[PDB]
């Protein structure tokens, strides 16, 4: 992908996305 | 504009599946089946 | 090409002629190169299998392409001629159990 690569601003509507419960746990570490 | 006739006369059908952002593309597969 | 599915959701559409029986299918506009060719008097159902990842996981959409018909006039004997695309109550999803 990295190979291939007023304005207006479209974000990915990331809230959809979800973790693995693992990567829960890393989240909560982080964040503390 | 698509042309009416052509409309009359087709046989093909369509559909179309939207997968939302976030959802795992890869696990995810469309198609048909009997 | 990747990264196409994040600003907006992945579009994959499904194409079936059923004079001749081919099975094409268009995704974010591009045809791609899976094709599939049935025998006549064959029953398909639409059908979509996917492993949740997060809390929406697909649509199904019964909208039209240019020049083609949507799939409730092939479903549906009254609405043979009706270019305009409908979901009728007894159209409905079902899963394998």
């Given at each position: 992908?990295?190979?291939?690569?007023?304005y207006?601003?479209?974000?990915?509507?990331?809230?959809?996305?979800?973790?693995?419960?693992d990567?829960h746990?890393?989240?909560?570490?982080m964040?503390? | 504009?698509?042309?009416?006739?052509?409309?009359?006369?087709?046989?093909?059908?369509?559909?179309?599946?939207?997968?939302?952002?976030?959802?795992?593309?890869?696990?995810?597969?469309?198609?048909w089946?009997? | 090409?990747?990264?196409?599915?994040?600003?907006?959701?992945?579009?994959?559409?499904?194409?079936?002629?059923?004079?001749?029986?081919?099975?094409?299918?268009?995704?974010?506009?591009?045809?791609?190169?899976?094709?599939?060719?049935?025998?006549?008097?064959?029953?398909?159902?639409?059908?979509?299998?996917?492993?949740?990842?997060?809390?929406?996981?697909?649509?199904?959409?019964?909208?039209?392409?240019?020049?083609?018909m949507?799939?409730?006039?092939?479903?549906?004997?009254?609405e043979?001629?009706?270019?305009?695309?409908?979901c009728?109550?007894?159209?409905?999803?079902?899963?394998?159990?």
């Open positions: 992908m990295a190979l291939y690569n007023g207006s601003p479209r974000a990915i509507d990331m809230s959809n996305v979800t973790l693995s419960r990567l746990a890393m989240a909560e570490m964040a503390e | 504009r698509d042309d009416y006739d052509f409309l009359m006369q087709t046989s093909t059908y369509y559909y179309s599946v939207r997968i939302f952002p976030g959802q795992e593309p890869a696990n995810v597969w469309v198609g089946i009997t | 090409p990747g990264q196409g599915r994040n600003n907006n959701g992945l579009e994959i559409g499904c194409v079936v002629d059923a004079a001749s029986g081919l099975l094409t299918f268009i995704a974010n506009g591009k045809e791609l190169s899976t094709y599939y060719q049935v025998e006549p008097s064959t029953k398909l159902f639409p059908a979509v299998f996917a492993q949740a990842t997060s809390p929406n996981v697909f649509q199904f959409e019964l909208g039209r392409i240019k020049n083609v949507p799939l409730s006039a092939g479903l549906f004997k009254s043979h001629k009706n270019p305009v695309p409908q009728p109550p007894r159209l409905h999803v079902q899963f394998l159990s």
